[PDB]
Amino acid sequence: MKQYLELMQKVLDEGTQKNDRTGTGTLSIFGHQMRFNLQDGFPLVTTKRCHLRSIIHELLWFLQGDTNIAYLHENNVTIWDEWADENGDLGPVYGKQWRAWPTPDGRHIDQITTVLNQLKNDPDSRRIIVSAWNVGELDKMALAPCHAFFQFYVADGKLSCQLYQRSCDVFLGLPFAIASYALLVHMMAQQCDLEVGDFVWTGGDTHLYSNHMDQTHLQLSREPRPLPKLIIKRKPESIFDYRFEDFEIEGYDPHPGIKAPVAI
Amino acid sequence: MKQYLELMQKVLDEGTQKNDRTGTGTLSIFGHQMRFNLQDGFPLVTTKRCHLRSIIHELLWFLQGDTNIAYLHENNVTIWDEWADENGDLGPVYGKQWRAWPTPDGRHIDQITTVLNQLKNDPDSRRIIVSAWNVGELDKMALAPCHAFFQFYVADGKLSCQLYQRSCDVFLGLPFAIASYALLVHMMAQQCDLEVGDFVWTGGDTHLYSNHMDQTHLQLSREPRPLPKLIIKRKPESIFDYRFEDFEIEGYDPHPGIKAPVAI
Numbered sequence: 286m287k288q289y290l291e292l293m294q295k296v297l298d299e300g301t302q303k304n305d306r307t308g309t310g311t312l313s314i315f316g317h318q319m320r321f322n323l324q325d326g327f328p329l330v331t332t333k334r335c336h337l338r339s340i341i342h343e344l345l346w347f348l349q350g351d352t353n354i355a356y357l358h359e360n361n362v363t364i365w366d367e368w369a370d371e372n373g374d375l376g377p378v379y380g381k382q383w384r385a386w387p388t389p390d391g392r393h394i395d396q397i398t399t400v401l402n403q404l405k406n407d408p409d410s411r412r413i414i415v416s417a418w419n420v421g422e423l424d425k426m427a428l429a430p431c432h433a434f435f436q437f438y439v440a441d442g443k444l445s446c447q448l449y450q451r452s453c454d455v456f457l458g459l460p461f462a463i464a465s466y467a468l469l470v471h472m473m474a475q476q477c478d479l480e481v482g483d484f485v486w487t488g489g490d491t492h493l494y495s496n497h498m499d500q501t502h503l504q505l506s507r508e509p510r511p512l513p514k515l516i517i518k519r520k521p522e523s524i525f526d527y528r529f530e531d532f533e534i535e536g537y538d539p540h541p542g543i544k545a546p547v548a549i
Numbered sequence: 550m551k552q553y554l555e556l557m558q559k560v561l562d563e564g565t566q567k568n569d570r571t572g573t574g575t576l577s578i579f580g581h582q583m584r585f586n587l588q589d590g591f592p593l594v595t596t597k598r599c600h601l602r603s604i605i606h607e608l609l610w611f612l613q614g615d616t617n618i619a620y621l622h623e624n625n626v627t628i629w630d631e632w633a634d635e636n637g638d639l640g641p642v643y644g645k646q647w648r649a650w651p652t653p654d655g656r657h658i659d660q661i662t663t664v665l666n667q668l669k670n671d672p673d674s675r676r677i678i679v680s681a682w683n684v685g686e687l688d689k690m691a692l693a694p695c696h697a698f699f700q701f702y703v704a705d706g707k708l709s710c711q712l713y714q715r716s717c718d719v720f721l722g723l724p725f726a727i728a729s730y731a732l733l734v735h736m737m738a739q740q741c742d743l744e745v746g747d748f749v750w751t752g753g754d755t756h757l758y759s760n761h762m763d764q765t766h767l768q769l770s771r772e773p774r775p776l777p778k779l780i781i782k783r784k785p786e787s788i789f790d791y792r793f794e795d796f797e798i799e800g801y802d803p804h805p806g807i808k809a810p811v812a813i
């Protein structure tokens with residue numbers, strides 16, 4: 286996608302060499318933002334083939350409140366295996382904070398239902414936020430959240446969303462986060478009888494791994510294709526009731542996949 | 550400053566009329582970012598005069614872990630007075646979160662000591678974050694944090710920082726915020742023996758109140774003047790030991806102030 290390919294070029298044109306936790310070495314910039322108008326097409330990268338199957342299942346798992354990879358496993362998604370313990374648990378990550386953030390006084394707050402109530406009854410609120418960054422539980426989490434926080438906004442019957450990603454693996458991680466949160470905006474909007482607006486992505490440490498540079502340049506030599514279209518075949522009674530079978534991507538003709546190693 | 554005035558113009562050209570909480574009316578956009586190179590000067594507005602004594606006393610109050618306005622009163626600062634109860638308490642806002650985030654089991658995490666140690670022991674970290682967005686205690690706070698989140702970053706021995714502001718009043722709150730966070734980056738850099746980098750400001754709902762339109766137009770005709778220089782006259786033993794006396798602002802020659810009503 287043009288916006289994505291421009292960021293890769295920016296990391297490469299004005300980035301600094303930084304070392305990191307995984308020992309690998311990164312090229313890095315701090316602070317970046319980009320906007321995708323959802324009405325132009327579903328923002329799934331076309332310069333390398335993406336696997337949408339895993340994006341969809343990971344999101345439905347999140348909305349269940351689940352932090353154990355069993356569900357993903359019975360759906361043949363292995364993207365979180367490396368971080369899971371012996372029992373498949375990842376600790377209180379995303380799904381637990383979204384559906385049941387713990388308070389000091391014994392309650393648990395379901396940030397996804399409160400947000401949905403807010404978009405229906407108070408869509409002009411400036412507080413329609415969901416946070417995964419729970420300071421007091423980070424130590425129990427297998428990996429600290431990279432998509433730490435997000436915010437919805439309504440204008441002219443359109444629902445927009447801004448994500449703040451604290452750390453970003455541009456080659457591997459960013460195609461996943463863009464499609465996952467664009468898919469969430471479509472579901473939310475359907476349930477609140479809104480039209481979709483903009484997905485806005487803001488990054489903290491935005492970086493390219495040293496062992497992904499050849500792949501990055503191969504990708505940068507491609508022209509973007511026209512964006513695919515998302516058709517949801519059913520309107521569930523609640524956002525927690527969507528199924529994989531309800532989503533259909535059409536008009537997706539991507540460039541061949543490019544493989545590259547993950548850093549654990 | 551050039552980029553502040555360019556955002557004021559952007560809001561006036563593209564803003565949507567939204568009816569907000571107080572019933573005044575805002576013109577707003579969603580999603581905006583600005584970079585400020587701190588080597589180039591302290592980003593204090595010169596198209597109107599701001600007062601640093603509130604900016605400095607409020608930050609020092611924050612790092613103290615205090616949420617009661619008595620200190621502010623003793624130092625002639627009135628900025629928070631409308632939101633404080635009969636006893637002067639604001640409830641568990643910034644000060645409580647920054648120095649004693651309440652974990653579910655009754656412990657407390659001192660986010661600024663953590664951040665200090667991370668900058669001195671693991672500066673390449675992509676997790677150097679302080680959060681004021683404590684979902685479990687939001688109902689107890691007199692007003693939900695507008696400055697919700699910020700992340701530090703170190704590259705080439707320079708300290709950068711990005712702030713996420715969920716809701717912004719471009720006219721009053723935004724000059725305050727930029728100076729407040731540029732000050733904290735200078736204090737942190739002094740205590741960690743680092744040089745200063747960039748302040749990145751990312752906002753959610755960025756707006757102009759309808760009853761500030763005249764005042765905005767006055768400000769948009771003034772030409773920005775050279776930025777000031779911040780001189781910290783004493784290196785204290787710790788980040789919690791600074792005093793108001795220690796800071797001086799050279800070269801500040803603003804245009805006269807513009808008075809404008811606050812919306813409660």
Ligand SMILES: C#CCN(Cc1ccc2[nH]c(N)nc(=O)c2c1)c1ccc(C(=O)N[C@@H](CCC(=O)O)C(=O)O)cc1
Nearest residue numbers: 336339340364365428454457458459461462547548549
């Ligand atoms: C974000 C997120 C979730 N995650 C979690 C996650 C956790 C830690 C990370 N760590 C690092 N260094 N980079 C990452 O992108 C990353 C991603 C992902 C995990 C794996 C793949 C991956 O291996 N990419 C393959 C996927 C193949 C498939 O889906 O079947 C690819 O083809 O690109 C992508 C996302």
Ligand SMILES: C#CCN(Cc1ccc2[nH]c(N)nc(=O)c2c1)c1ccc(C(=O)N[C@@H](CCC(=O)O)C(=O)O)cc1
Nearest residue numbers: 599600603628629718721722725726808809811812813
């Ligand atoms: C940021 C922040 C904290 N805050 C808190 C705070 C709380 C609620 C708000 N509500 C609204 N509608 N706008 C705000 O900017 C706002 C700010 C501030 C409070 C007052 C001023 C203010 O009135 N500015 C005067 C200061 C004059 C002085 O005493 O020196 C000015 O005109 O410059 C700024 C910031």
Ligand SMILES: *c1cc(=O)[nH]c(=O)n1[C@H]1C[C@H](O)[C@@H](COP(=O)(O)O)O1
Nearest residue numbers: 306429431452453454458459675676
């Ligand atoms: C974290 C998870 C995700 O969904 N997307 C990402 O881009 N990442 C990346 C960031 C970094 O490369 C690594 C996480 O480790 P760290 O805490 O940033 O050091 O995976």
Ligand SMILES: *c1cc(=O)[nH]c(=O)n1[C@H]1C[C@H](O)[C@@H](COP(=O)(O)O)O1
Nearest residue numbers: 411570695696716717718719722723
């Ligand atoms: C909050 C605090 C600050 O430092 N700066 C700000 O601009 N504000 C503004 C945002 C909004 O105009 C109002 C807070 O109310 P709301 O929760 O956004 O509705 O003060």
